[PDB]
Design a protein around this ligand. Structure first.
Ligand code: BGC
Length: 628
């Protein structure tokens, strides 16, 4: 295995003796050289555990590092100042000052020029993080909402140009907002240049995807493969016009990239460097679970998958230190947490808390949520959770069956109930969601629908507004970076005409991806409307989170409320949070509150509450008590 000093002299070999002496004395090389010495051993070690003694490893590594230097040299100085800042402040993600938001540029603002006009609103809401959905070129028609990339360099013409994106990112930075986008790396479209060339037999793009001659290997892999979209195709394979079969974990038009080929890592690390120099602060690493395949296994969460992410991390620590990663792993809780590490993905989605928030709204019992917050919330140093209520995706009931079994709950039967409840197929249900990917072969099903539709705002349930304020309060105060699905702050309902659209009809996720509702946003300052009650309710919680230091960090200690309907947790041994998940008044007795001080100020309602007597919480009431 080669060292950092050796490879650095090979990088400088492209320069003539006269200009080489000039680069060695420059500030850009002094920083790159320091970061190479510190972070290259990790890059070498991770790439070695995956590729081993591959002939292509050394030539790939040298090509990658040469490209990494050119990328850091070309990098803007304003971005180099953010590199220095975050290199010396790894806990910026754990700060209570951070509140995030997510939206589709076309649905929320039309185009990129329209999005920069929406920036004063993001500042009004108090956002310091903005996640933009797939901006790059995708095929016309079905593209999985932009998740089938045809070109990582060209922006979708309907949204604008590559220059318009640089202007948006710079305008976000001036407003004190971090730019977050997707790094669609597990797969590309079947219309991508690499895809067409690999299938055509071009030797430069050989083994870039997993192409098989018949059903022999696909049948053997399918014995252990989980179906993500069973409505589209069985297993994880799709057929071409010539008779060959290709690995398609998702849609038929989304072909899985082959990370067993060292050249695919290089190709994708080059695409990462491009995104880094645009000014992107955090990259969303979707489908991190599927980047490595092996016969006999589920081809999910394999050791080499984690090692490849850690290798990508090292490329960033060397050529763009400001670029952090956000893991999206909608898998078993034991596997979700393994992607989170300072040397892997610094932040990651929290599907467990999210799914259990909805479960608790259905059952009215906090048992599962309490268990999750007590045993699975705390993370290692320099890492944070991305807590959310809703996303562009469906809700999967990804709680642990083993955790549920300890509480006397059968995982299969509980998911049967939750799915029936949330799609309005259970008596007295307030939820108005629609099914997504019902698999008759497994009994598994996911739920589509906005936060407002699932709490009952569509039929004007009087408890609906309070339910949204309750779910968001947990995401905003548990510890981690909260991500608001833009449109939820005004109670936006489902898109009614998704089902009668040929390009959207086979994907129920479009029910929860509606356009910017002008009418609801114009009612945001009116306390008499549902939209105004939700906005002012959420805005108050955001204001309190950002100004009060008691919410700092990602750590928590749960509090036993002795009431199965009320959740309780303590932040920094100074903030006691209570959340009633029942539609009836619930009580935390004087007995349970004996250790707490006599009086405590509530940050939600503003009243001074006595804890020396019985505390009765109103239907879906949230209380943030200052106990120190
Ligand atoms: C992550 O990626 C999958 C496949 O591209 C997409 O369907 C999901 O919506 C996205 O979050």
């Amino acid at each position: 295995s080669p060292n950092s000093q050796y490879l650095k002299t090979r990088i400088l070999d492209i320069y003539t003796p006269e200009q080489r002496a000039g680069i060695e004395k420059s500030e850009d090389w002094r920083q790159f050289s320091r970061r190479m010495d510190t972070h290259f051993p990790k890059l070498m070690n991770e790439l070695d555990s995956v590729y081993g003694n591959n002939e292509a490893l050394l030539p790939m590594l040298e090509m990658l590092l040469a490209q990494a230097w050119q990328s850091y040299s070309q990098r803007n100085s304003s971005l180099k100042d953010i590199d220095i800042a975050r290199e010396n402040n790894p806990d910026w993600i754990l700060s209570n000052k951070q509140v995030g938001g997510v939206c589709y540029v076309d649905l929320f603002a039309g185009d990129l020029k329209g999005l920069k006009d929406k920036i004063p609103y993001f500042q009004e809401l108090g956002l310091t993080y903005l996640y933009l959905m797939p901006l790059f070129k995708c095929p016309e028609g079905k593209s999985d909402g932009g998740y089938a990339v045809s070109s990582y360099r060209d922006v979708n013409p309907a949204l604008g140009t590559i220059g318009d994106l640089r202007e948006v990112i710079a305008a976000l930075h001036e407003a004190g907002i971090s730019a977050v986008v997707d790094f669609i790396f597990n797969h590309t479209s079947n219309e991508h240049e690499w895809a067409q060339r690999c299938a055509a037999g071009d030797p430069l793009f050989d083994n870039f995807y997993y192409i098989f001659p018949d059903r022999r290997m696909p049948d053997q892999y399918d014995r252990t493969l989980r179906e993500i979209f069973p409505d589209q195709h069985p297993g994880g394979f799709s057929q071409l016009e010539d008779g060959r079969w290709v690995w398609t974990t998702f849609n038929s038009f989304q072909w899985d990239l082959n990370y067993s080929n060292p050249w695919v890592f290089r190709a994708m690390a080059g695409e990462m460097l491009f995104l880094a120099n645009l000014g992107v602060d955090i990259l969303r690493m979707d489908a991190v679970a599927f980047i490595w395949k092996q016969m006999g296994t589920s081809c999910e969460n394999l050791p080499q998958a984690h090692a490849l992410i850690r290798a990508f991390n090292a490329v960033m620590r060397i050529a763009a230190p400001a670029v952090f990663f956000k893991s999206q792993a909608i898998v078993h809780p034991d596997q979700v947490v393994q992607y989170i590490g300072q040397d892997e993905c610094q932040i990651g989605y929290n599907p467990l808390q999210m799914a259990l928030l909805w479960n608790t709204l259905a059952t009215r019992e906090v048992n599962l949520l309490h268990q999750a917050l007590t045993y699975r919330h705390n993370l290692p140093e320099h890492t944070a959770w991305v807590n959310y209520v809703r996303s562009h995706d469906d809700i999967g009931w990804t709680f642990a069956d083993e955790d549920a079994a300890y509480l006397g709950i059968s995982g299969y039967d509980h998911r049967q109930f939750l799915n029936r409840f949330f799609v309005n197929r259970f008596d007295g249900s307030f939820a108005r969601g629609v099914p997504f990917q019902y698999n008759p072969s497994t009994g598994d099903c996911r739920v589509s629908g906005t936060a407002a539709a699932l709490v009952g705002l569509a039929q004007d349930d009087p408890h609906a507004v309070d339910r949204i304020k309750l779910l968001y309060s947990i995401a905003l105060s548990t510890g981690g970076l909260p991500l608001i699905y833009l449109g939820d702050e005004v109670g936006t309902l489902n898109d009614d005409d998704w089902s009668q659209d040929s390009n959207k009809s086979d994907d129920s996720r479009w029910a929860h991806r509606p356009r910017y509702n002008e009418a609801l946003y114009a009612q945001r300052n009116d306390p008499s409307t549902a939209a105004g009650q939700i906005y002012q309710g959420l805005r108050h919680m955001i204001a309190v989170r950002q100004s009060n230091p008691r919410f700092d960090g990602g750590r928590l200690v749960t509090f036993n409320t002795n009431n199965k309907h009320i959740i309780g947790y303590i932040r920094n041994n100074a903030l006691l949070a209570f959340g009633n998940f029942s539609e009836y008044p619930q009580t935390v007795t004087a007995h349970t509150l004996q250790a707490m001080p006599f009086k405590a100020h509530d940050l939600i309602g503003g009243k001074t509450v006595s804890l020396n007597q019985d505390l009765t919480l109103q239907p879906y009431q949230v209380m943030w008590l200052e106990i120190a």
